[PDB]
Amino acid sequence: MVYVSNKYLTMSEMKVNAQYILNYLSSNGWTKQAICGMLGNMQSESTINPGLWQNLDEGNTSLGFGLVQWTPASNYINWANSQGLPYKNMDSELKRIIWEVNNNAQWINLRDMTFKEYIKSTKTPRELAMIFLASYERPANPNQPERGDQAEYWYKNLS
């Protein structure tokens, strides 16, 4: 059970999605700290909603889409089609993230941490949230300390 929609999720809805993500990425070698660092970013990006378009502008493929707001959406969407995967889908997006780790895509090492180091890291979810913000997400506004608060909130409240 996951929520997939073009709608901002409530804290209760997010917790359902966040536990799912934690389970899935644990099976693929990520630390709970690394996952929670990423979840803190996903909350700001999309309220951890794989169905969410930037500004809720459904179908605008020039802008952000999905858990981490892949931008332009079309690059992710093109990737899913080439893989035979449905784009609007939790597992498809989690597969994209694994593919990015494996092929050194998206990540730019601005904090002396590679993506492969990141997923194995036991630094705090706050520190990891900030590294992931700077290295992976790189939004127009870099000042989003809330992302570290949120990472810690998920680390405490998920299993």
UniProtKB/Swiss-Prot annotation:
Residues 1-159 are annotated as: Lysozyme-like glycosidase. It comes from the Viruses. Substrate binds at E45, T71, Q106, E137, R138, P139, A140. It is found in: Virion. The active site is at E45 (for lysozyme-like glycosidase activity). May serve as a plug to restrain the highly pressurized packaged genome and thus would be the first virion protein to contact the host cell wall, degrading the peptidoglycan layer and thereby facilitating viral genome entry into the host bacteria. Acts probably as a multifunctional enzyme that degrades N-acetylglucosamine polymers (in vitro) and cleaves the peptide cross-links of the host cell wall. Essential for the tail assembly. In the N-terminal section; belongs to the glycosyl hydrolase 24 family. In the C-terminal section; belongs to the peptidase M23B family. This is Morphogenesis protein 1. The gene is 13. The chain holds residues 1 to 159 of 365 of the full protein.
